[PDB]
Amino acid sequence: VLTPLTEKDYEGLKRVLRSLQAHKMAWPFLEPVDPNDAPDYYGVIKEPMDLATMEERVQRRYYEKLTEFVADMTKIFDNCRYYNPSDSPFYQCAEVLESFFVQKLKGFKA
Numbered sequence: 383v384l385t386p387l388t389e390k391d392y393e394g395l396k397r398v399l400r401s402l403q404a405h406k407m408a409w410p411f412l413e414p415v416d417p418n419d420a421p422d423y424y425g426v427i428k429e430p431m432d433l434a435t436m437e438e439r440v441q442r443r444y445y446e447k448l449t450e451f452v453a454d455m456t457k458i459f460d461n462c463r464y465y466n467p468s469d470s471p472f473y474q475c476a477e478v479l480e481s482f483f484v485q486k487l488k489g490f491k492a
């Protein structure tokens with residue numbers, strides 16, 4: 383996953399993100415969390431991430447490596463499961479959407 387990203391790669395990456403942004407379980411991860419939404423959220427999580435910031439980032443070719451792309455995506459799943467207890471629907475959203483991301487990510491690697 384260390385090989386530099388090509389222009390063709392970025393097209394693949396854009397679709398993964400749209401695939402993700404359209405998922406019915408992605409609604410808590412589309413935008414940066416609203417501190418009204420989550421009481422103490424920004425005291426708790428040292429590195430928040432959401433799908434608009436990756437979209438911004440892809441757009442701007444922030445990503446030199448798949449490694450770095452998966453890094454950001456996993457941060458969104460990790461943050462939710464850390465901040466949220468195992469039985470929150472937000473946590474279950476993280477479960478559903480991460481396997482989807484792994485399904486889609488497996489598609490891209492091939």
Ligand SMILES: CCCNc1cc(-c2ccc3c(ccn3CCCN(C)C)c2)nc(S(C)(=O)=O)n1
Pocket residue numbers: 409410411415416418419420421461462463465466472473475
């Ligand atoms: C009680 C703590 C629950 N914790 C949460 C809550 C949320 C959350 C809540 C509402 C939400 C969105 C997104 C839209 N809305 C609707 C209202 C949009 N505007 C700003 C008013 C997210 N996201 C996570 S998360 C990212 O999975 O960690 N955790």
